[PDB]
Ligand binder design. Structure first.
Ligand SMILES: Cc1cc2nc3c(=O)[nH]c(=O)nc-3n(C[C@H](O)[C@H](O)[C@H](O)COP(=O)(O)OP(=O)(O)OC[C@H]3O[C@@H](n4cnc5c(N)ncnc54)[C@H](O)[C@@H]3O)c2cc1C
Ligand SMILES: *[C@@H]1O[C@H](CO)[C@@H](O[C@@H]2O[C@H](CO)[C@@H](O)[C@H](O)[C@H]2NC(C)=O)[C@H](O)[C@H]1NC(C)=O
Ligand SMILES: *[C@@H]1O[C@H](CO)[C@@H](O[C@@H]2O[C@H](CO)[C@@H](O)[C@H](O)[C@H]2NC(C)=O)[C@H](O)[C@H]1NC(C)=O
Ligand SMILES: O=C1N[C@H](CO)[C@@H](O[C@@H]2O[C@H](CO)[C@@H](O)[C@H](O)[C@H]2O)[C@H](O)[C@H]1O
Length: 585
């Protein structure tokens, strides 16, 4: 039930990695900010209560404890988003509430390579410095600075060093991403998940010019032509709001932080995206009758440029490797570990599940002269059906420089699907994957008693890869990006860009997108830190824009090539004439 007289300078939709820092920075500016979130309170510091019984009374939830982070894989109900075919957090904090918490200071090349000018490394470096001040990493999240069950790590790390790879502290040497290995850095603090929920959101929630609406889903933005007047909400759970909440007249702005799939969905429901997809929404049961008319539609490649890390698992077994069962930690945690975590915030439970071992990287020049970026995540766990005890999984991510891309589309149910699988469309992407496995095998070839289970010694790396099914189900990294791509090439004219350098949606004066969806591709690394940095950076670009200026009566307020204000001065309205012209009348 949305209140009589309330409006906001900024409305930020979605409480994830993009939305929380954006809403924090914008409310820090003194502007009035409303953060609308689908899900409910998650970590205890947001007032979340949800978790196992051994946490009861200890001021902790399932979202606070690093060693419980893998529960999401066996118990996601009411937490994971249901309007997508992939894995996403639909609680407050979004993906940062449920992810493994890996946190990386950006590799400069990622911004220089992926982004146009104004977003290159020189441009976002102040933003990088802000994000890493708010959240420095720690590669030793146990509050005593000790690390636990490192047997496996020491196995692989010693192996790698002998193979010619160099130890770094990853976030002290962000740019050393080639033939490098490191202790895994996390956004944890005080032995707890922390992150954006622990920093950005906490400073925000203290401000009286800041408001959060939980349990509230944004159906779409309401707009007259290219000017968004408000956002339309319905309760996702009891205590959510039903209605249309306005933004400050003329001057007010909306930011879509709902995620690569969620923000794209909202745009489509708002009559922004490819014709065929808008036409799907228009035909739909839920939205057909109330959708904005097809003459107000803005055609942008929403859902194109779908990107993710290509994940390829590898498994080894070594006798010194010690498995820890983080799943049995949900119900019946080993008591001394329960104890050191609850009293001291120390021990294996202050580390993310499963035990996340050496982190390492290399860059491989392909036949096309394109440098492709590999990241490996070693963790102590079976993967391909290898048994859990002495195994370690080594997961290769194919990152920046990969050329393959997919597409997201929307169902008649208004749920999103990955309908064009992104991975390995281009042969040189595959070559990098194969070469990386070969390269790793070379590094680890002198390690005694080390066994290759996956691929086993009788299968070549090429054969091993060639055998694998290429599908999001077994190959996704849950790093989905790119559906609202940021760029200078206006999508209305056939370009690939959904939003411009200020993250403004082409065809609008006040609508912006800050989340994973704007990245032209995936970075070297687990993307959360990058997404926070992009929010630091985008919110500053937005904050430095001059206030929007209404058009005088008879002036042009719209059209398919219009760059300007879409909103009219008092005493006139924007009126559509044709696809190239709207006038204030
Ligand atoms: C479990 C898993 C493991 C991962 N591990 C790592 C890791 O260790 N480190 C790393 O850097 N990254 C990791 N990631 C990647 C990461 O979680 C995402 O890339 C990142 O959090 C996405 O940022 P976002 O702002 O675009 O979207 P999100 O974080 O998903 O935020 C979207 C938010 O908007 C809300 N929302 C969505 N639609 C609507 C709507 N219509 N109305 C209102 N609210 C809405 C959602 O509930 C959610 O809170 C992992 C993620 C997964 C799922
Ligand atoms: C959002 O919805 C959640 C879940 O429906 C509400 O959280 C529950 O609140 C009741 C009583 O207030 C508690 O007994 C439950 O333990 C809570 N569950 C969880 C998972 O937190 C929450 O109150 C709602 N929030 C708002 C603002 O309406
Ligand atoms: C990353 O480091 C490795 C090793 O330092 C580089 O490997 C060299 O690659 C060139 C061709 O790309 C070969 O001709 C050399 O013989 C390789 N040297 C070794 C020791 O393997 C690799 O090129 C580096 N990657 C990038 C992108 O700079
Ligand atoms: O960034 C990530 N970080 C973590 C850690 O690297 C990954 O979690 C892994 O995700 C796998 C599922 O894809 C699980 O089988 C595995 O146990 C779990 O640790 C996650 O899928 C990936 O997106």
């Amino acid at each position: 039930p949305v209140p009589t007289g309330v409006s906001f300078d900024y409305i930020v939709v979605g409480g994830g990695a993009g939305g929380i820092p954006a809403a924090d920075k914008l409310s820090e500016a003194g502007k009035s900010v409303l953060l609308i979130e689908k899900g409910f309170a998650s970590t205890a510091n947001t007032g979340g209560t949800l978790g196992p019984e051994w946490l009861e009374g200890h001021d902790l939830t399932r979202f606070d404890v690093p060693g419980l982070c893998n529960q999401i894989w066996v118990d996601s109900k009411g937490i994971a988003c249901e309007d997508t075919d992939q894995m996403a957090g639909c609680v407050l904090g979004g993906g940062t509430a449920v992810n493994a918490g890996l946190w990386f200071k950006p590799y400069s090349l990622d911004w220089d390579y992926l982004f146009p000018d104004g977003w290159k490394y020189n441009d976002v470096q102040p933003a990088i410095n802000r994000a890493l001040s708010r959240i420095p990493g720690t590669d030793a999240p146990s509050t005593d600075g000790k690390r636990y069950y490192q047997e496996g790590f020491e196995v692989l790390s010693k192996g790698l060093a002998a193979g010619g790879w160099t130890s770094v502290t990853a976030n002290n040497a962000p740019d050393k991403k080639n033939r490098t290995f490191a202790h895994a850095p996390f956004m944890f603090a005080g032995g707890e998940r922390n992150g954006p929920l622990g920093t950005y959101f906490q400073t925000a929630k203290k401000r009286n010019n800041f408001d959060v609406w939980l349990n509230t889903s944004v159906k779409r933005v309401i707009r007259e032509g290219g000017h968004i007047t408000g956002v339309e909400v319905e309760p996702f759970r009891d205590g959510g709001y039903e209605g249309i909440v306005p933004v400050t007249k003329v001057t007010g702005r909306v930011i879509l932080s709902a995620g690569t799939f969620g923000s794209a969905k909202i745009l489509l429901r708002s009559g922004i995206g490819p014709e065929d997809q808008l036409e799907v929404v228009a035909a739909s049961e839920k939205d057909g009758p109330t959708m904005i008319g097809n003459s107000s539609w803005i055609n942008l490649p929403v859902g194109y440029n779908l990107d993710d890390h290509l994940n390829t698992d590898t498994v080894i077994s070594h006798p010194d490797v010690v498995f820890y069962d983080f799943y049995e930690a949900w119900d019946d945690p080993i008591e001394s570990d329960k104890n050191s975590y609850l009293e001291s915030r120390t021990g294996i439970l202050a580390q993310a599940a499963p035990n996340i071992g050496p982190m390492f990287w290399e860059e491989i020049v392909g036949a096309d002269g394109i440098v492709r970026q590999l990241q490996w995540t070693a963790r102590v766990e079976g993967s391909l059906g290898a048994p859990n005890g002495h195994t370690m999984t080594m997961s290769q991510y194919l990152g920046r420089g990969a050329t393959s891309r997919g597409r997201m589309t929307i169902t008649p149910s208004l749920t999103t699907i990955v309908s064009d699988v992104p991975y390995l469309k281009d042969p040189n992407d595959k070559e990098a994957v194969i070469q990386g496995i070969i390269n790793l095998q070379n590094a680890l070839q002198n390690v005694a008693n080390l066994t290759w289970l996956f691929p086993n010694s009788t299968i070549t790396p090429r054969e091993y890869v060639e055998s694998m099914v290429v599908s999001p189900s077994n190959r996704r990294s849950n790093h989905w990006m790119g559906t609202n791509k940021l760029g200078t090439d206006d999508g209305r004219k056939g370009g690939s860009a959904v939003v411009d350098l200020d993250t403004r949606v082409y065809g609008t004066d006040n609508l912006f997108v800050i989340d994973a969806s704007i990245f032209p591709g995936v970075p070297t690394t687990n993307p959360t830190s990058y997404i926070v940095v992009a929010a630091e950076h985008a919110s500053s670009r937005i904050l430095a824009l001059p206030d929007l200026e209404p058009v005088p009566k008879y002036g042009q307020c719209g059209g398919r090539e219009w760059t300007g204000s879409f909103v009219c001065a008092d005493g006139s309205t924007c009126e559509y004439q044709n696809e190239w012209y709207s006038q204030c009348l």
